[PDB]
Symmetry: D2
Subunit: 425 residues, 4 copies
Amino acid sequence: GTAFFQQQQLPAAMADTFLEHLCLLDIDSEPVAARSTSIIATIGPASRSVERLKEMIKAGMNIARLNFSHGSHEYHAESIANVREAVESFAGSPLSYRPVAIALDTKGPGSGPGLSEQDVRDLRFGVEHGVDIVFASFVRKASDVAAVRAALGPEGHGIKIISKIENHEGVKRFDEILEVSDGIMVARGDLGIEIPAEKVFLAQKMMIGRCNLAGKPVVCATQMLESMITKPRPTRAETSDVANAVLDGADCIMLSGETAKGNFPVEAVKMQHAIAREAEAAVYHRQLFEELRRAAPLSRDPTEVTAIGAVEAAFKCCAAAIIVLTTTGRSAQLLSRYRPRAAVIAVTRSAQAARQVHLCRGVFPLLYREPPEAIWADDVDRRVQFGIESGKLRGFLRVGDLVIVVTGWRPGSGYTNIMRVLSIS
Amino acid sequence: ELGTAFFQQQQLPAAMADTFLEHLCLLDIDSEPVAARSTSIIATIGPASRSVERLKEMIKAGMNIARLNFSHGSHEYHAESIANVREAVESFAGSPLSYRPVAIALDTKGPPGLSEQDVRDLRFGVEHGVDIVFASFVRKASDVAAVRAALGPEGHGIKIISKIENHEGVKRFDEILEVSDGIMVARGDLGIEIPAEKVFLAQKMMIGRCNLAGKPVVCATQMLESMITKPRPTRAETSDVANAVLDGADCIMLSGETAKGNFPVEAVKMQHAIAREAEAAVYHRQLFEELRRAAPLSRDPTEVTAIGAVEAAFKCCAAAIIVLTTTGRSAQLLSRYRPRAAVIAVTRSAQAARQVHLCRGVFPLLYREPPEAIWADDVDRRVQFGIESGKLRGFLRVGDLVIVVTGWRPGSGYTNIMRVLSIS
Amino acid sequence: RADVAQLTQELGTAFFQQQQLPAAMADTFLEHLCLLDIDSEPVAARSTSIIATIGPASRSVERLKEMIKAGMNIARLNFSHGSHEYHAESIANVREAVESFAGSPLSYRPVAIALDTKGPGSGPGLSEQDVRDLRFGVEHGVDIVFASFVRKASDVAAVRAALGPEGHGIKIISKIENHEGVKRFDEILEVSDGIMVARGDLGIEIPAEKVFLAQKMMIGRCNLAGKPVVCATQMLESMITKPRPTRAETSDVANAVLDGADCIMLSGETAKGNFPVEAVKMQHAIAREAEAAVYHRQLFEELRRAAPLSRDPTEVTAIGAVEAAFKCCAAAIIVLTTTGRSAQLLSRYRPRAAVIAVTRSAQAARQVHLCRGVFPLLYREPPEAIWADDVDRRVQFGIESGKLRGFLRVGDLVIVVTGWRPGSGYTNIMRVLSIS
Amino acid sequence: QQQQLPAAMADTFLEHLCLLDIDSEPVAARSTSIIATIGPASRSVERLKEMIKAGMNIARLNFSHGSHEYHAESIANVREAVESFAGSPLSYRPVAIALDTKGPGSGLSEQDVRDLRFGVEHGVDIVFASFVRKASDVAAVRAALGPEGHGIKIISKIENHEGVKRFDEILEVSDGIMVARGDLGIEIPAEKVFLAQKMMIGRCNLAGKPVVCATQMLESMITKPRPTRAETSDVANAVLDGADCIMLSGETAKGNFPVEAVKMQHAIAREAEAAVYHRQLFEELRRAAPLSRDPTEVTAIGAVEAAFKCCAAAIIVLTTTGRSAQLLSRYRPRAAVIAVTRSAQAARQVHLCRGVFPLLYREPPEAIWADDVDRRVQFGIESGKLRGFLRVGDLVIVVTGWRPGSGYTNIMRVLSIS
Ligand SMILES: Nc1c(S(=O)(=O)O)cc2c(c1O)C(=O)c1ccccc1C2=O
Ligand SMILES: Nc1c(S(=O)(=O)O)cc2c(c1O)C(=O)c1ccccc1C2=O
Ligand SMILES: O=P(O)(O)OC[C@H]1O[C@](O)(COP(=O)(O)O)[C@@H](O)[C@@H]1O
Ligand SMILES: O=P(O)(O)OC[C@H]1O[C@](O)(COP(=O)(O)O)[C@@H](O)[C@@H]1O
Ligand SMILES: O=P(O)(O)OC[C@H]1O[C@](O)(COP(=O)(O)O)[C@@H](O)[C@@H]1O
Ligand SMILES: O=P(O)(O)OC[C@H]1O[C@](O)(COP(=O)(O)O)[C@@H](O)[C@@H]1O
Ligand SMILES: O=C([O-])C(=O)[O-]
Ligand SMILES: O=C([O-])C(=O)[O-]
Ligand SMILES: O=C([O-])C(=O)[O-]
Ligand SMILES: O=C([O-])C(=O)[O-]
Ligand SMILES: [K+]
Ligand SMILES: [K+]
Ligand SMILES: [K+]
Ligand SMILES: [K+]
Ligand SMILES: [Mg+2]
Ligand SMILES: [Mg+2]
Ligand SMILES: [Mg+2]
Ligand SMILES: [Mg+2]
């Protein structure tokens, strides 16, 4: 239909140049797709009430951040329990249940060179309480990431380490840090004090670009909607900053004081949600996909090979979604690195992977709870049908849509190799 | 890894260039072609190439399609030539490393409508089971419809390749291509009907439009003309063959060179050698991107699977794309995106195996095994047949990655699956 | 590597590490972002003009001199506040601070005066207060009018009519502040001299989360049209009370420049805030960093591809001069202009080289601040007897001022743009000159 | 529209090919120079006048055949036919004389030393040096031309594997290259010659140096009045590849249709030049060309950019050595490069550069240098109007210098005709 091609900035998406793409942006072209940039909300006095956390989950919060710079272990354990109670209050309806990751933001090394003793204790607290992510403060070199990894012990092997770049050394040693990290956070607060304030945008745009190239998650953080701590609406610079972080290529956007201590935690989440949807439709996918494809090296890994085939197939038919079965989240992450316009619906039995895939843009995790079928092929199909039924319920899919389905040839992680074109019935 | 030697062969340094100009500068005469020759060779069978023994040598040299020119000879003469082609083709039906399907194409004499002789010759083609018709002097869409009507109740599966030989056919090209299975740039008559210095424009335009439409295009006439009397061609002749391949031609043709000349086998060998060199020199980076950008969005799962499979093949430098096809359509749709990987088409149809030679880079395998009771097993047996033939022919080695294209249920029109397999 | 090797041996590796030059030679926009370096220092003069609102915090002659030194190019007078007497006093103070540096072209900095109208309130047509304020502007010789709440082409015709016969030279920058203005944008831009993305009212008239789409669309269309575009409101809002801005604020300023804005504006930051000079200095520092981070390779190619073929010799000379400037990394393009038009046409192709515009018109010297990368040099000398010698004196004046201000260095290449006959509209010559 | 303008505005090379129209007639003058070998079939003064009218720009004398006396007679006949049109200076066409050496066979041969000395004594403009295989071979040819031999342009013939492999070092010291396909097709596999041709043409286009495509281009025309389909295709593809010159050997030296072979190359080259995809070509030439601090190089790119912006009918350039015209030519403008020169040798040698139309200025010098320049520019305009290049209302780009003498080009002006 003609109405379909007027929505989600589709006239601007078919432009032959970036300049004509900008000229074709339409304030009346309403976003159609689900919001793909994850929202991280920092927990605190303003957002710990189980009833308030349910409202923030409904507003769009995907990751709950625990700032270990404030509060005791007892306070953070209560935070975790309240988060989990609000999240599990929706588990009764599996087709609409939203997983929410728990991220521990460390205090940092302070005037020291290595892992502080408080960080060692907080990291072990995280492992004991099953946190999904660590936002490691003031990472300056690859050895800092190794020390965080060592402090998590043998039972914290699955925890994702997102390195916070907050100073000149972190920016200069970026490549070595990214190589050993699961992802990066552009921690603009400290970075804006450590380097000239007028240079932060260069560091942000560089790090987002390099993470997009590496296929690793990147978070844009601090003062995104700062004025919303006290005011019900943000400034023009604030909405622009959120939209530009999304247009830059950020996988996640973050709220600090806006959700931890402010008077508008639910409204700050709703504002980030509304801006991110508008900004994602305004992404010039033609140039982005082409540049991601050209820059990505050749690969002999069947997961990586299937992912680019599926993203290409998804673009060819305007697929509403790419449904992928995943154990660790990796197959969904490899689909995500090519920035498809189609939503990546990731079906998994791992509650931890379902939480952690929120770090990857455009990945919508679905927690599958059923015990395995006796016939593996039937078990794979029930999970694909679960993705279709959830997608229909959530508005991602309709009858007649085309979907790309990504599976593997055998059980277990690391064997994704099949891409199938499916029509929604 | 694949090794430094791997990335110096088949013009791979020139393939990674960021501009077409840089790509030309990086072409290396020492960079040897490794992939199998993907542009099919059509050889005209006449007095100089009719014998069963000569035909076996032409098949070994690379002939994929045998052309019978109905402007010369009689029905009896061409029936004997067809029988000799089939005898030479079936002489290799043992050793699978030598058995190659060979299509039979009937080139009509030409025309106020369809000529009485054309109606009789087209009827002869149906009775003798020809695979293709090269229809002479097609000027408009109604000319194709007349040839289509003459292919009668039994020959609707025969491919009609319209020969564009005059100003009217060039001007009415879009309407002709829409109703034809493919096109032949018949340069001989075209060079007399329009100024000789304009033929290259017509050739480049028609090849481009056929590539865009995803339909086969043949470059024909005087490609190696001097080889009718001389054992080696001129510098202009080898250049013409290489440039037809670089232009985007699916097939290249030999007329008098193989029908009446003194070096028919040498002419086939020469076209084979040039085509291999020219295919490695194709700038796939720009070609694939432009084919992709110009091709409209599709909701046909075969077309969607094909672009996914070609993208996947480039990503891992796949040795081949193995496709299961009954009519040849799934292989044709893979072929339109010009993959560097060979498209191994496994089929139970002898006709589809011969006809897919019209599509660049499609290597047909005719499968004769009895069907398995379980369809999923029958599919795996043909996929393994393609891998084993590929290993035997030199396309594949253990540890290689291949892309496998199949459908979700039996029958034609359901291709929707692309799998990345590691060769064991 | 080979398309920079000889110039790298000549100019040195240090030259090619500054002003984001490694990021500028990238083959993709993605590679360009990856190559951005916080240690790559900006070298070029700041090309995006700063508009500062003059009010209670920035009215004094002494404060205004500090603001001019900090980088203020255009003084905005908001006719929504104050009286005619109040704004006349502000204009006189701006002119006194500006003329305190008139002693030498090396210290002179021309500053435009812009009148921002109150608007039509609930009225469809021009308000009676606007008619009086517009006549005040003509009587006080303002250079620009920022016309509030423009909704259609007839609104700009009404503003033009209210300026009378003596306000023909005044530039009209239409403020787009509502849904109707955005929808009728093309018809408004066609009759306006430029546009202002008035985000404050626009953010109330349309959903706040859609303002960035309107800003990016309008900046793109103005860049395509070759007309000035201003990004305005809340750019450094927190600097009204704090000495440093938020991370969102510096990002917003950098992104307005990266979007293609010719001017950036400060409102309460300079009108009523505690850090007016610091707000101007902050916009100057961010704009210099953001201009070096512009991906000129894609920008110039896209401006070329989108611009139609032209038979106007000024337009033809401008693209030839911008192409020549990029080829040799020219330090500047010196252009002779009467109305500012030849400098504007150079400016639409976004050269990295500074456009030094030599003019005798004091008004054109002030108004060219609306065009990104145009540095106005007012020529005060009496005309020579021979026209060709007058032109050469003006060109040498640009070179000597450029050397003294640091734009030009010995060994640099400059591109010189002149005409064949006197008078406006005859630019047709481009010359490559080596600085000795 | 004419001259493949619908195909020229295409956004992709594929769509450009699809838009090629056999009814879109070429309008611009033929840019690719034709080199014709002068021999028994083309030696007469009367035959040479018809070859000049057919389009011959450079006369090649093959020193593998004939004697010094024979070639001197051929040179005299070429000069007599060329000067028969000098009465009308606005339409006179200069013709270069090129000496093709015999070669080294089994250093520089003693016969080559004598033939090169003959060339200097007879004022040849170009040397096509046979079997160049390294930079030292070019230096030997340069030495054999003596102190009174720097004026002659050395075009190195690449005819074997070593020449192809050491191409970059040969191109660096040569004025240009000839893809000598005859010997190259015997020295390397015949099916690889197209790779060597396309690589060498690309590298010469990148270097901004002339490249000639030679041998068997219209071979069948030695005995037949019309060429084969492969032959016309080969000529068109050499032009589409980026060749500055195309050559006729036996077709003009010993064949039954020498004038027809020249006419055929002229007709094909005009069609192929209009089918060049300038959008991609200019962008790639610009991107690949290095940054430069030379004002001639800087003015050249500015002028070519300005010409495309207004669809300029021509770029009129004043040149002493031909260098300013060569630097304009390397950017492949669609606009004709009309090179107004006082040097007769420069007017002949500039035929090696695609799209350069040489004009010999034979009017008296004006008193004011500034006045003298304007008359050389008006000369270009009057010749252009007479030859069909220009019409009243057209836009031209004029490339002049700031001071007399070679090496000072730095000015580009946009001028409206009449
Ligand atoms: N040139 C010719 C070609 S063609 O250009 O390759 O089409 C084909 C043929 C002949 C040609 O002369 C014959 O003489 C001939 C005689 C008797 C039976 C059959 C043929 C024949 O097929
Ligand atoms: N923010 C303000 C702005 S604006 O937002 O930058 O336009 C402008 C002004 C004021 C602001 O506070 C005043 O208080 C003011 C008082 C008395 C006379 C004139 C002004 C004035 O022009
Ligand atoms: O993204 P991961 O962790 O590699 O998971 C992909 C795996 O998921 C599957 O699709 C389903 O496997 P399971 O039945 O073990 O969940 C496998 O075939 C595939 O290897
Ligand atoms: O190219 P075609 O003619 O559509 O053939 C493709 C068909 O081949 C298959 O892959 C295998 O089908 P069969 O088992 O019937 O041969 C089908 O699933 C698919 O529809
Ligand atoms: O940019 P404008 O307004 O068209 O002015 C450019 C004009 O300036 C000049 O360079 C010099 O003109 P004047 O002698 O009138 O100052 C003209 O040749 C040219 O037409
Ligand atoms: O093309 P070349 O060899 O560099 O020389 C072109 C020369 O032509 C001029 O425009 C005019 O020079 P002349 O007075 O010597 O004819 C010079 O200014 C310029 O240096
Ligand atoms: O730690 C952070 O979030 C910061 O410094 O911005
Ligand atoms: O019929 C043909 O093949 C021709 O005319 O070239
Ligand atoms: O008028 C203004 O400046 C605004 O609305 O932002
Ligand atoms: O010498 C030549 O010209 C050749 O061999 O092609
Ligand atoms: K912290
Ligand atoms: K025939
Ligand atoms: K106002
Ligand atoms: K010779
Ligand atoms: Mg911090
Ligand atoms: Mg014919
Ligand atoms: Mg307003
Ligand atoms: Mg030779």
